[PDB]
Amino acid sequence: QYHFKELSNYNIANSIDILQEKEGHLDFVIIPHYTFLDYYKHLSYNSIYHKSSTYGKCIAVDAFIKKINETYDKVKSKCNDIKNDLIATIKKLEHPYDINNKNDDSYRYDISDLMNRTFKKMMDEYNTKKKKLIKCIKNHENDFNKICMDMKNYGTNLFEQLSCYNNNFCNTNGIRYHYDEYIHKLILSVKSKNLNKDLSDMTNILQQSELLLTNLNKKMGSYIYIDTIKFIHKEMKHIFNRIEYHTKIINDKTKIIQDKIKLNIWRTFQKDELLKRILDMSNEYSLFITSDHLRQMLYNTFYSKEKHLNNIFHHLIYVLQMKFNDVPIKME
Ligand SMILES: *[C@@H]1O[C@H](CO)[C@@H](O)[C@H](O)[C@H]1NC(C)=O
């Protein structure tokens, strides 16, 4: 009858975050899955740390969690060839020609809200290649559910074995111990970070780079690197929107966990009340952990793209400096 975390009644494809921490690398996270696996991970430690006599069960729990991690990562690796095929296409869209020869002032008018015909051809491939990856993840859904259910069944079995000296006044040492050893470190790590300042700095990058794009678009327009910038800028906007979503959660859950933990330690509860509060803390930690994990990787992706974006603008420094209504080689 207890409120246990269930598998989403949502349409999977809408809850996937794509990460690109460095060049030549792409990965994905099915958000509900990560939250679900993390939820039951906390439920498992809370169940074995309740009684001072079951602390020794941690190695078995650690082994099982590591197994689930391997098994889950094995299913997601079934989409590797197809994911690698997407990476090759992104490589083409982001690097249409080499911009590394500083002793080369070459204007690529020869190639051919996008305009460039050759970029538009590479873009349609990207749309198909991306759509295929989502279909591959959607096609392996049941295999992902099977693993999620095995983690659910394990956590729930441990939780059913939780027992008190007197059901009228159950102890909360498990909640205290687990927090202190598994959660508290993460809370302090978040609290040492200025997440809102990170958002301000990203907002400025996006708005300032948009002005540089507006300038280039007016002078060049049809140039392949203009579409490349339009492509990187749009990706950076989605990335930022995701960081903003996760930051809101991180900030909320930091306050809630700190407040809720104070209401739960160094006191007793009737068994029923104890179990409901373990399920509720597990929910707060899973949501907080999922978002800090994603935020960190999305932050890395944003700056990986920004570094390239900055290199393209530096490559087009001559046109950026050029006078209003003055234009470089016009193309057709
Ligand atoms: C599960 O996730 C990753 C898999 O690479 C790993 O770094 C992490 O330590 C694993 N968690 C546990 C508790 O084994």
Author numbering: 146 to 257, 294 to 513
The authors write:
PfRh5 is a member of the PfRh family and binds specifically to the receptor basigin on the human erythrocyte surface. It forms a complex with the cysteine-rich protein PfRipr during merozoite invasion; the complex is peripherally associated with parasite membranes and is released at the apical end of the merozoite during invasion of the human erythrocyte. Antibodies to PfRh5 can block merozoite invasion, suggesting that it is a potential vaccine candidate.
We determined the N-terminal amino acid sequence by mass spectrometry and re-expressed this region in insect cells to produce a highly stable module of PfRh5 that we denote PfRh5-C. The shape of PfRh5-C approximates an elliptical disk, the core consisting of nine mostly anti-parallel α-helices that encase a small β-hairpin located near the N-terminus. Helices α4, α5, α6, and α7 assemble as a triplet-helical coiled-coil domain running the length of the long axis of the molecule. The first disulphide bond is Cys345–Cys351, located at one apex of the helical bundle. The second disulphide bond is Cys224–Cys317; Cys224 lies close to the N-terminus of helix α2b and Cys317 close to the C-terminus of helix α3a, that is, in proximity to ‘kink points’ of the parent helices α2 and α3. A search using DALI indicates that the PfRh5 fold is novel. Comparison of the Rh5 structure in the bound and unbound state shows that there are no changes in the core structure on binding of receptor.
